[PDB]
Structure 1
Amino acid sequence: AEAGITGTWYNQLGSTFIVTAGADGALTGTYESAVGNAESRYVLTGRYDSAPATDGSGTALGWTVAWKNNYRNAHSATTWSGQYVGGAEARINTQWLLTSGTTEANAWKSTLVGHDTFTKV
């Protein structure tokens, strides 16, 4: 993994994220939603587990993006949890949770759930 993870990944909706997997489990990079402008680039930080098994198992990882940058503040944060699978067709299969800051009465509807698959192509 690690080396295999570092690079650019694209999901099915048009988002891109570039990440560096450091020697001791760190993941650091940027997530860009669309257009191709600095305005849709947000910082991402996460971790991956740097000594994955040798039975062809995926590498468990996760990262968070807070949706605030210098052009936008969407008062929300998204975390992606999943695993990296390398090889010919490497992919990161994830499930995500997006929480928006709400008032206490609207807290019950503050989190959306979805999934995303990222590829290098």
Structure 2
Amino acid sequence: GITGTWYNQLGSTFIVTAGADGALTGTYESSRYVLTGRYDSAPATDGSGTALGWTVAWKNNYRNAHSATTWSGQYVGGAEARINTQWLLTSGTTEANAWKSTLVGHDTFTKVKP
């Protein structure tokens, strides 16, 4: 299922546990940073994926970028499991610079290094 170690298309490492209560917990390496999120613990049974999302704030004991990324996507099971996401990366800014505070992109995760 969702629990496991995943890799995006650029080589980041996403180590996640999907708990019984809908919780996502784990670490993200782009050293390691804390992540938390949520997932649908009772998905549909019609072939649809499992909706999920998580957040990393880019502060650890070694660096602070004053920013945070959220990933929103779905887990698609099968022979080659995948998590397909789109993400928003917001930096702390002054009000005058807030218009350019948020980057957007898309990450796809598999259980194999790219």
Q: What interval of TM-score do these two structures reach, taking the shorter chain for normalisation?
A: over 0.9
Question: Which runs of 5 or more residues in structure 1 are unaligned?
Answer: 34-39
Query: What residue in structure 1 maps to residue 63 of structure 2?
Result: 72
Structure 1 stretches of at least 4 aligned residues deviating more than 6 Å after TM superposition:
none
Which secondary structure does the structure 2 equivalent of 1:108 belong to? helix
Q: CA deviation at 1:31?
A: 0.1
**CA shift digits 1:23-75 (9 cap, x unpaired):** 11000000011xxxxxx100000000100001100000000000000110000
- C-alpha distance in 1 between matches for 2:52 and 2:94: 31
> If the length of structure 1 is used for normalisation, what is the TM-score?
0.92
Measured after TM superposition, the shift of residue 84 of structure 1 is 0.1
Structure 2, unpaired ranges of 5+: none
Cα RMSD of the aligned pairs, angstroms, is 0.4
More helix by share: 1
The answer on 1:24 being equivalent to 2:21 is: yes
Query: Number of matched residues?
Result: 112
The sequence identity of aligned pairs, in percent, is 100
Deviation at 1:12, TM superposition (A): 0.6
Q: Compute the TM-score of the two structures, normalised by the length of structure 2.
A: 0.97
Cα distance in 1, alignment partners of residues 50 and 39 from structure 2: 7
